[PDB]
């Protein structure tokens, strides 16, 4: 069984299970604003409110939820602030009164103090009804930015599909013991039984189509989810007032960030993060974005001795077949991907009268996974 440690749960892994959907009363006035930023954006009212507010203390955020709860709220809160009604007009100045208790909350979860995936995606989430199972019917997210961003789909999806790789992470263990212990048989069942989970996924993966729109995707979601790195309109970064002297540029959230989205791609011993291209640093920083935890998790896989490099040395047909499953699927994963960003970036940008740094990446990560097969 994998260690706790790494709070990876045995039913749903990165994300976190049955996550705190209210915060200690003390902090109502910030749980106000994050519940209702679609109207208080466009009413003209939100930077009102968050001007508004005293500096509330981190110190009754107890538990880890509590606290990884109130990062998200913070998180909203923050993107709503700096980027407003999404058209362009800017804020480079977060508040003390939220500046202060977020980028405390942070640096104790040891996060950057911008929205990340890990926020907005693995804590951002309620089943409704307890008893019924992880489907798209029987959940909710937490909160949204504008209305019909069509936030609740791209968010549930990309959690349905963490859940469905959770299966997967559940073997990895069983994979290095079976090369530590030279048990053949068993490590191919392993990597089949691997394969079949993101097979698995990329069959949720397909759900994206009927909870999201193009238009409504280009033109609003995607502007509350950038970052102030290397961006235009925020040549220097954000200045967090109180906390840091100077404005300090962080990325905006993207797939990358997700855990399964590299820690499979390390397990099967490609070199993602090796070599220093353009996407392979890119990568490599987005593992700092992670929770503390998680980024453990990657680390060690490095440390443990090479799955291909086992895989080549045996000489085993089987072992290559079952193997190459595995990269296979990643491969179809990446691909679908590609597709999705067609449908949902390139096309609508192309009818506004980046964008395309984003495929680039894929392409070569993409790449990368189908030169690491052996067949
Ligand atoms: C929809 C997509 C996403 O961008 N979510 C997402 C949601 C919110 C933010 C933010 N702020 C950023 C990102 C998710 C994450 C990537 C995942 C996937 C794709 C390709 N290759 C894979 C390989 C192994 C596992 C998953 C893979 C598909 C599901």
New binding site residues.
């Given amino acids: 069984m994998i260690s706790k440690e790494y709070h990876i749960d045995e039913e749903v892994g990165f994300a976190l299970p049955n996550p705190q959907e209210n915060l200690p009363d003390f902090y109502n006035d910030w749980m106000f604003i994050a519940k209702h930023l679609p109207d208080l954006i466009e009413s003209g009212q939100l930077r009102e409110r968050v001007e508004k507010l005293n500096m509330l203390s981190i110190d009754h955020l107890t538990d880890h939820k509590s606290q990884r709860l109130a990062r998200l709220v913070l998180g909203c809160i923050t993107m709503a602030y700096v980027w407003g009604k999404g058209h362009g007009d800017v804020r480079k100045v977060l508040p003390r009164n939220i500046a202060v208790p977020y980028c405390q909350l942070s640096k104790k979860l040891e996060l950057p103090p911008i ?3 890990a926020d ?2 693995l804590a951002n989430w309620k089943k409704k009804d307890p008893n019924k199972p992880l489907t798209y019917e029987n959940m909710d997210v937490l909160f949204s930015f504008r209305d019909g961003d069509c936030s609740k789909g ?2 549930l ?2 959690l349905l ?1 963490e859940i469905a ?1 959770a299966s997967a992470i559940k073997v990895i263990p069983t994979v290095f013991k079976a090369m530590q212990m030279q048990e053949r048989d068993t490590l191919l069942k392993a990597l089949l039984e691997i394969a079949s989970c993101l097979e698995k ?1 990329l069959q949720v ?1 397909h759900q ?1 189509h009927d909870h999201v729109n193009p238009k409504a995707f280009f033109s609003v979601l995607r502007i509350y ?1 950038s970052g102030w790195k290397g961006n235009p309109q925020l040549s220097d970064g954000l200045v967090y007032e109180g906390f840091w002297e100077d404005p300090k540029e962080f990325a905006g ?3 990358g ?2 855990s ?2 590299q820690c ?1 791609d390390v397990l099967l011993g490609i070199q993602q993060t090796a070599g220093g291209g353009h996407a392979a640093q890119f990568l490599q920083d987005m593992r700092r974005y992670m929770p503390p935890a998680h980024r453990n998790f990657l680390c060690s896989l490095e440390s443990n001795p090479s799955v291909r490099e086992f895989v080549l040395s045996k000489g085993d047909a089987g072992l290559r077949e079952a193997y190459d499953a595995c990269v296979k699927a ?1 491969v179809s ?2 691909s679908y ?1 590609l597709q999705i960003v067609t449908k949902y970036i390139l096309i609508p940008a192309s009818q506004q009268p980046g964008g395309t740094d984003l495929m680039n990446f894929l392409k070569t990560v993409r790449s990368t996974t189908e030169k690491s097969l052996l067949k």
């Fill in positions: 929205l990340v995936y907005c995606v791209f968010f999806v990309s599909v790789a996924a993966f994206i989810l959230g993207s797939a960030q997700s399964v989205f499979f990643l994963l990446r991907h």
